[PDB]
């Protein structure tokens, strides 16, 4: 009764470090998630999740379900990856905390370096120069001599392989730019990185292999702004886009999704996805990106009505004071 343990070890991998916790057997995804966020000193929690792997696909820990009721490998230690599941529409405006900025920066940078997000050559060099400023601080020629970035992974392999320039030549190109960032703090460098990275075409898009009613292979993109249909030969530019405020509803029925445009003149867009595991993620990401999009609109409109009011209050206050003279 009191001899069976009340907890089990869970390993949590962030972009920074790994750490272990005592997860209570009864705990839900929310309990474990909140413990991780508290430990990290992270309050902008809504962008994040705890990911594991079901078969070959990614699975996020569901908040309302028991940790142990998930299909996660139970070999000691049960491991989860603390990652961003949602991206802001404007990183500079939305990522208030340094920890949030840092975690987004490392994850997005890994996506860039792993070629999960296409990045052109010049952009890649500029991005590397900010990653160097963030890690090394201000450029110092007496300390940062030739070969100082020799052991660093700074550009996508795709970019390195297009030119056949030597590592020291890439380092020179990166150092030339790095010299221009003198004075910028770590958080400032990481934010300049994100401002460039957030304008990349594949940034923040969750792609899924889908088929239309005619059996034509396409890619679905679920992002902060809406649902997007890509031709599989082009992941950069979608051919059709349905912004979250221009969708009446999304319905799912027997491996078939139906996007119902708000404009009744546009016909419904039906598509098929085979794996039920994937269909659960698509729905999750639609419901949750839609909700965050709506909340940004509510925050935007509230922020306007607060300025309007404060301007009227302050203008009227200052007028009242002028009439007392």
Curated annotation (Swiss-Prot):
Mutagenesis / variant outcome for changing residue 127 to P: In SWNV; loss of ability to interact with the CUL4A-RBX1-DDB1-VprBP/DCAF1 E3 ubiquitin-protein ligase complex
Domain of life: Eukaryota
Effect of residue 325 to F: In sporadic meningioma
Effect caused by changing residue 48 to S: In SWNV; loss of ability to interact with the CUL4A-RBX1-DDB1-VprBP/DCAF1 E3 ubiquitin-protein ligase complex
Keywords, comma-separated and alphabetical: Cell membrane, Cell projection, Cytoplasm, Cytoskeleton, Deafness, Disease variant, Membrane, Nucleus, Phosphoprotein, Tumor suppressor, Ubl conjugation
Gene Ontology terms for molecular function: actin binding; integrin binding
Domain FERM: 8-297
Substitution effect: residue 103 to I: In sporadic meningioma
Cellular component, GO, one term: perinuclear region of cytoplasm
Keyword Nucleotide-binding: no
Organs and tissues of expression: Widely expressed. Isoform 1 and isoform 3 are predominant. Isoform 4, isoform 5 and isoform 6 are expressed moderately. Isoform 8 is found at low frequency. Isoform 7, isoform 9 and isoform 10 are not expressed in adult tissues, with the exception of adult retina expressing isoform 10. Isoform 9 is faintly expressed in fetal brain, heart, lung, skeletal muscle and spleen. Fetal thymus expresses isoforms 1, 7, 9 and 10 at similar levels.
Known outcome of mutating residue 50 to P: Abolishes binding to AGAP2 and interaction with the CUL4A-RBX1-DDB1-VprBP/DCAF1 E3 ubiquitin-protein ligase complex
Record-level GO BP terms: actin cytoskeleton organization; cell-cell junction organization; ectoderm development; hippocampus development; lens fiber cell differentiation; MAPK cascade; mesoderm formation; negative regulation of cell migration
Processing and modification events after translation: Ubiquitinated by the CUL4A-RBX1-DDB1-DCAF1/VprBP E3 ubiquitin-protein ligase complex for ubiquitination and subsequent proteasome-dependent degradation.
Subunit structure: Interacts with NHERF1, HGS and AGAP2. Interacts with LAYN. Interacts with SGSM3. Interacts (via FERM domain) with MPP1. Interacts with WWC1. Interacts with the CUL4A-RBX1-DDB1-VprBP/DCAF1 E3 ubiquitin-protein ligase complex. The unphosphorylated form interacts (via FERM domain) with VPRBP/DCAF1. Interacts (via FERM domain) with NOP53; the interaction is direct. Interacts with SCHIP1; the interaction is direct.
Disease: Schwannomatosis, vestibular: An autosomal dominant neoplasia syndrome characterized by the development of multiple benign nerve sheath tumors called schwannomas, particularly affecting the vestibular nerve. Affected individuals usually present with bilateral vestibular schwannomas but can have schwannomas on other cranial, spinal, and peripheral/cutaneous nerves. Meningiomas are common, whereas 20 to 35% of affected individuals develop intramedullary spinal cord tumors called ependymomas. Mesothelioma, malignant: An aggressive neoplasm of the serosal lining of the chest. It appears as broad sheets of cells, with some regions containing spindle-shaped, sarcoma-like cells and other regions showing adenomatous patterns. Pleural mesotheliomas have been linked to exposure to asbestos.
Known function: Probable regulator of the Hippo/SWH (Sav/Wts/Hpo) signaling pathway, a signaling pathway that plays a pivotal role in tumor suppression by restricting proliferation and promoting apoptosis. Along with WWC1 can synergistically induce the phosphorylation of LATS1 and LATS2 and can probably function in the regulation of the Hippo/SWH (Sav/Wts/Hpo) signaling pathway. May act as a membrane stabilizing protein. May inhibit PI3 kinase by binding to AGAP2 and impairing its stimulating activity.
This protein's name: Merlin
Organism, as annotated: Homo sapiens
Portion of the parent chain present: 15 to 339 of 595
